[PDB]
Amino acid sequence: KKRVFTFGKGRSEGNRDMKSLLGGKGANLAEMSSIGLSVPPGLTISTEACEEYQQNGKSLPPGLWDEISEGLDYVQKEMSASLGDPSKPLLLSVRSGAAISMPGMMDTVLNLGLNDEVVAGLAGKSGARFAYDSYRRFLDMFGNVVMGIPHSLFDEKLEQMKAEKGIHLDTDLTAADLKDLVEKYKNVYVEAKGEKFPTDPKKQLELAVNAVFDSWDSPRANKYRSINQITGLKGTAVNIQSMVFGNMGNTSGTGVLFTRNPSTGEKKLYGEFLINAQGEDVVAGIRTPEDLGTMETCMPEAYKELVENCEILERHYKDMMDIEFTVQENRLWMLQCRTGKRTGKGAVRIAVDMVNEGLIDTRTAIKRVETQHLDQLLHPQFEDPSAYKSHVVATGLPASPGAAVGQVCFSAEDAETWHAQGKSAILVRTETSPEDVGGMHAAAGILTARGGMTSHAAVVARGWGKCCVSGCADIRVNDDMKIFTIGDRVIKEGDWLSLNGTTGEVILGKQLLAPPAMSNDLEIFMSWADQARRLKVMANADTPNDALTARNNGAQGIGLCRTEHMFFASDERIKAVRKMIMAVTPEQRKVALDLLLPYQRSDFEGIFRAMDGLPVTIRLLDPPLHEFLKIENLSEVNPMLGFRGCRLGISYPELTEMQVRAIFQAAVSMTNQGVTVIPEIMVPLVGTPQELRHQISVIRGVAANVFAEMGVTLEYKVGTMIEIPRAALIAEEIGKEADFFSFGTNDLTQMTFGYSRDDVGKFLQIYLAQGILQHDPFEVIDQKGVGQLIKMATEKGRAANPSLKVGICGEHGGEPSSVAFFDGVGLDYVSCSPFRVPIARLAAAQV
C-alpha cells in the first residue's frame, strides 16, 4: 500500500489521527500542514516500512526508495531546489518518531545534503559563516548519529582549534576558521572508522533512513519496550523534511514553548528562544536562551505570527500545546507540536478555564485531568501545627514537602512488609540506595541523616510527592539494635513518628492529618465529577477522625469499619484485649468480652456521630488472635488462613454476641439524638452459606434482645465480605441469605493467585521484569482471573436477590483501571482510604 506521505503548503496526505503509521510527530506535522501553518515541507515513511525493514533482514523494500524519490520530487518542487545542486541546494533533516514518545530512537540529523560543492554555493547565496557552520554541524551530527562516532572526537577538534588559535567562544570563529574545522571534522571520519565521509547526498539520506530504522531495534529502545510492557508498536516513522535555518544571523533562532504555563495553568505563552542556533540548542544548556518577551521586541513579525499560530493550535487541538519552532530571517516556521505535559495544579486550571472559554465541555475536562494530576493536590497537611510544635525532637532538611505519620522501620524489606500488612511505615535510614526504592515507595515518609536537597531520598521522594526529611545529622541510626538516638533519647522499631517534610521537623508519635484541597477550580472540577459518576464512593474509616475526615472528602458512607482497629485506644483497650486473647475456660472468656462493651460502644458512638445520615458498614472481628503480642496454642503456620474471621466467631460465638450488641446499643443510643443511623453488619471470610446463616442467627438473636432496651425502630442489613474464592463459586446460595456483598480483593487476590503479600517480595519484582505479571495484582485488579470471580459472584448474587447491594472495600478502590472495571461489572460502590476518596471520585467519573 502507500508508505510515503508528503506534507507541504496547505496540503498533507495524513492527519493527526494516523499516529500508528506516522507517529505523533509525522501525524502532527501533517495536521499542521493541513491547518495552514508555515511548516517546512517533507515526507514521512510509514512505520510499516520500518516493520518490513526489520523483517526482510535490514533492507529497503523494492518500491520504497522510488516512492521516497516521488515524495522528494514533491519537496524539491515546492522548495524550488534539488538535493546536491550547488546552484539551488535543498538541505534536509531526518527525524524519528513513533506513535508513543520513547527513548532509543535515532536523534535527528540536521543539515543533511552537504559537501564541498554545495557549501561553496550555499556560502555564495546565504553567507559564508552560516554555510561552513552548518557543514560543521552536519559532519558532527551525521557522524555521531548515523556513523556511531562519539561526539567527543568532534568537540576535541573544536577545542583544539580554540587552543591553537587562542579563540575563546564559538561566536569568535571566522568563516575560514570554520572552513578549516570542516576539514578537521572530515579527518575524524578516517581516524575513527577508516572510511571517508559520504559526499553523495543520496547515500547520506539512505544511511540516515537505515539508521532510524536500526534505532527501533536499539538496545536502549528494546530495554524501554521490555520494561514498560509496551507492545503493538511495530516500528517508527521517518520524517524527511526541508531545512529552515535558525543560524543564518541574529534575525533567526530556535525556540520552544507551552501555550500556557504548565505549572500554574496561566494563559500566557511559556517558552524559551535562542538566537542564531539550530534545533535542540535551546535545551542543550551550553548557551543561555532568552524568554519570549525578548523575542517580542527583537523579532516582532515572527512573534505576532507565533501568537497567531498558537491561538490557532489551541483552537484546533482544543488543548494546551507543547511546540517547537524555528525562525529564519524573521520568518517563523513550525516544526513540532503535541499536547503539553503539565502539573496537577495546571491541569485542573487549564481544564476549568477551557470550559469557561467554551473550548471543551465537562466530559472532556474530566478526561483531561489524570488521577496522577489529582494525586499531586491531595498531599496531606497537619491539622494544627502548634499542637506538635512541642514534640519536635529533631529538625533536618525539608527534602520533599508533605506530612507523614507512621511507625519506625529500618529497612525497605520491612517497609514493603508493613505496607502489605496495612501499617503506615516511616523508613528511617542513614542514607538510601536504589536497592531501597521499592520499600521507599511503600513508606509514608522517609527520614535520612545524610545527604542534602539533592540526596537520593530527596530526589526520589520529590518525584513521588512523598514526605522526606534529609540530612538530619543529629540522628544516629543503628540497624543492628533496631533503634536510632537523638542525643540521649532512644527510638525503637515500631514506635510512632511524624515528619513535616515542608519544615523538616521530626515529631514524636501520631499526629492529626488533614486534606488541604482548597482550590476553587478544583472544587468546581470535583463538582463535575460527582455529577458524572454513577458509582458511589464509601470510605474505610475506623477512628472517628477518619470518619469526619472521609466525609469531608465527599464520601457517601463507610464501606468498611474494622473492629480490630478499635483496640488502638489506650492502656484500657490494649491491655484488655490481652484478656480475651489469653482466655481459657469460656467463663474466663466471657469476663473479658462483657467487660468491653463501653470500651467499644463509645468508640462506635464516635463513628456514628461523624457519619450521621449515611450508611456505615461495620465488619466483625477479622484477624487472628496471635497478633496482639497459652501463646503456643495460638501460634499458626499460615495465619492468613488460620483461626480467623467468622471462623473465630462461630467457634467462640460470644465475640460476635459482644460486638453485635455494641453496634446495636450504640445505634439506639445515637439514634435518640436525631442522628440518622443506617448500620450494616458484615461477616468476614464466608466460604460456606451455613457460616453466614450461623452469624445471621447470632445477629438476629442479639438484635432482638437489644431491641428490648427500648423501641426497636432501627431497621438494619447484614451481609458478607466476599474474600474466599469458594464464596464466588457458590454465591447463589449466599445471596439469598445476604443483604449486601462486599469484595475483599486483598484476600481474594491472595487466595486466587496463591500469593502471601508479605512473602511476595522474593519473586514479585522479578515477575514484573520478565513480563510474567503485567501489573501488581495487589494495586491493580486482575480482570482475567480475580475479575471472573467478581463477575460470577455479582451475577449469581443479583440473580438470587434483586435488591442486593454489591460493593468493594479492598485497596483496589483507588486504582482507576480497577474502578473502571467495577463499573463494568456493575457494582454499586467502591470503598477506599479517606485520602484516596477523591481519586476514586475522579476514577468513577472518567467512565
Ligand X SMILES: Nc1ncnc2c1ncn2[C@@H]1O[C@H](COP(=O)(O)OP(=O)(O)O)[C@@H](O)[C@H]1O
Instruction: Give catalytic residue positions.
Output: 456, 809
User: What distance in Å separates the CA atoms of residue 458 and residue 475, rounded to the nearest whole number?
Assistant: 17
11 annotated as a binding-site residue: no
Give the interface segment with ligand X, choosing from 65-73, 188-196, 237-245, 780-788 (CB under 6 A). 237-245
Among 93, 261, 411, 617, interactor with ligand X by CB under 6 A: 93
Site residues (CB under 8 A) for a second copy, limited to 725-754: 725-726, 729-730, 747, 750-754
Strand partners, 429: 448
Toward ligand X, which CB reaches closer, 25 or 345? 25
User: What distance in Å separates the CA atoms of residue 704 and residue 712, rounded to the nearest whole number?
Assistant: 8
Phi, psi of 771, deg, nearest 5 = 65, 25
CB 781 within 8 A of CB 815: yes
Among 8, 14, 40, 787, interactor with ligand X by CB under 6 A: 40
562 annotated as a binding-site residue: yes
Dihedral over Cα of 257, 262, 267, 270: its sign: negative
Nearest approach, Cβ of residue 641 and a second copy (Å): 4
**What would the x/- binding string for ligand X be over residues 441 to 480, using CB under 6 A?**
----------------------------------------
For the record, the C-alpha cell of 815 comes out as: 486504582
Give the interface segment with ligand X, choosing from 79-87, 160-168, 238-246, 351-359 (CB under 6 A). 238-246
Among 45, 75, 90, 110, interactor with ligand X by CB under 6 A: 110
Beta strands in 712-762 (DSSP E): 717-722, 740-743
Among 271, 279, 557, 649, interactor with ligand X by CB under 6 A: 279
User: What distance in Å separates the CA atoms of residue 795 and residue 810, rounded to the nearest whole number?
Assistant: 19
- Please report whether residue 766 would count as binding a second copy according to CB under 8 A: yes
Which residues lie below 8 Å from residue 681, measured CB to CB, with a gap of 6+? 618, 620, 660, 663, 699, 716, 717, 718, 719
462 annotated as a binding-site residue: no
Burial letters 337-373, b for 16+ CB under 10 A, else e: bbebebbbbbbbbbbbbbbeeebbebeebbebbebeb
Toward ligand X, which CB reaches closer, 137 or 349? 137
Give the interface segment with ligand X, choosing from 188-196, 240-248, 427-435, 738-746 (CB under 6 A). 240-248
Site residues (CB under 8 A) for a second copy, limited to 637-696: 637-643, 647-648, 650-651, 685, 687-688, 690-691, 694
- Please report whether residue 65 would count as binding a second copy according to CB under 8 A: no
Nearest approach, Cβ of residue 793 and a second copy (Å): 12
- Please report whether residue 25 would count as binding ligand X according to CB under 6 A: yes
- Please report whether residue 794 would count as binding a second copy according to CB under 8 A: no
Among 37, 98, 119, 243, interactor with ligand X by CB under 6 A: 243
For the record, the C-alpha cell of 680 comes out as: 450494616
End-to-end CA distance of the chain: 37
Toward ligand X, which CB reaches closer, 328 or 695? 328
Neighbour count for residue 301 (Cβ, 10 Å)? 12
User: What distance in Å separates the CA atoms of residue 592 and residue 586, rounded to the nearest whole number?
Assistant: 10
- Please report whether residue 759 would count as binding a second copy according to CB under 8 A: yes
Which residues lie below 8 Å from residue 799, measured CB to CB, with a gap of 6+? 732, 735
- For Mg ion, the binding residues (CB under 5 A) are 324, 336, 622, 744, 747
Question: DSSP letter string over 275-322?
Answer: ES--TTHHHHSSS--EEHHHHHHHSHHHHHHHHHHHHHHHHHH-S-EE
**Size of site (CB under 6 A) for ligand X:** 17
- Please report whether residue 302 would count as binding ligand X according to CB under 6 A: no
Residue type, 297: T
- Please report whether residue 336 would count as binding ligand X according to CB under 6 A: yes
Nearest approach, Cβ of residue 832 and a second copy (Å): 23
- Please report whether residue 44 would count as binding ligand X according to CB under 6 A: no
16 annotated as a binding-site residue: no
Q: Is 126 exposed, middle or buried (0-12, 13-18, 19+ CB in 10 A)?
A: middle
**What would the x/- binding string for ligand X be over residues 170 to 189, using CB under 6 A?**
--------------------
Toward Mg ion, which CB reaches closer, 76 or 239? 239
Toward a second copy, which CB reaches closer, 391 or 700? 700
Site residues (CB under 8 A) for a second copy, limited to 690-719: 690-691, 694
Nearest approach, Cβ of residue 421 and a second copy (Å): 9
Residues 209-212: contacts with CB under 8 Å, at least 24 apart: 209/45, 209/60, 209/68, 209/94, 209/238, 209/240, 210/53, 210/58, 210/60, 211/94, 211/106, 211/145, 211/146, 212/50, 212/94, 212/95, 212/96, 212/105, 212/106, 212/236, 212/238
Partner touching 13 among ligand X, Mg ion, a second copy, none, CB below 5 to 8 Å by kind: none
CA dihedral 103, 106, 112, 114 (to 10 degrees): 120
Among 95, 260, 536, 812, interactor with ligand X by CB under 6 A: 95
User: What distance in Å separates the CA atoms of residue 323 and residue 257, rounded to the nearest whole number?
Assistant: 5
Nearest approach, Cβ of residue 767 and a second copy (Å): 7
Among 12, 134, 254, 448, interactor with ligand X by CB under 6 A: 254
Toward ligand X, which CB reaches closer, 108 or 470? 108
Toward ligand X, which CB reaches closer, 108 or 665? 108
- Please report whether residue 19 would count as binding ligand X according to CB under 6 A: no
Partner touching 701 among a second copy, ligand X, Mg ion, none, CB below 5 to 8 Å by kind: none
CB 90 within 8 A of CB 113: yes
Among 15, 788, 817, 833, interactor with a second copy by CB under 8 A: 788
Q: Choose among 223, 81, 147, 841: nearest CA to 525.
A: 841
Nearest approach, Cβ of residue 685 and a second copy (Å): 6
Beta strands in 684-818 (DSSP E): 717-722, 740-743, 805-808
Toward ligand X, which CB reaches closer, 271 or 279? 279
CA dihedral 780, 784, 785, 788 (to 10 degrees): 110
Toward Mg ion, which CB reaches closer, 309 or 371? 309
Neighbour count for residue 763 (Cβ, 10 Å)? 12
Radius of gyration of the chain (CA): 33
User: CA dist 652 to 589, 590, 643, Å?
Assistant: 9, 10, 11
Q: How many helices (H) and strands (E) does the chain have?
A: 35, 32
Toward a second copy, which CB reaches closer, 148 or 771? 771
Strand partners, 555: none
619 annotated as a binding-site residue: yes
CB 597 within 8 A of CB 658: yes
Give the interface segment with a second copy, choosing from 103-111, 562-570, 581-589, 633-641 (CB under 8 A). 633-641
Residues at the interface with a second copy (CB under 8 A): 636-643, 647-648, 650-651, 685, 687-688, 690-691, 694, 723-726, 729-730, 747, 750-756, 758-759, 762-763, 766-767, 770-773, 782, 784-786, 788-789
Annotated binding site: 562, 619, 723, 744-747
Annotated binding site for substrate: 562, 619, 723, 744-747
Annotated binding site for Mg(2+): 723, 747
Residues at the interface with ligand X (CB under 6 A): 25, 40, 93, 95, 108, 110, 241-244, 254, 279-280, 324, 326, 335-336
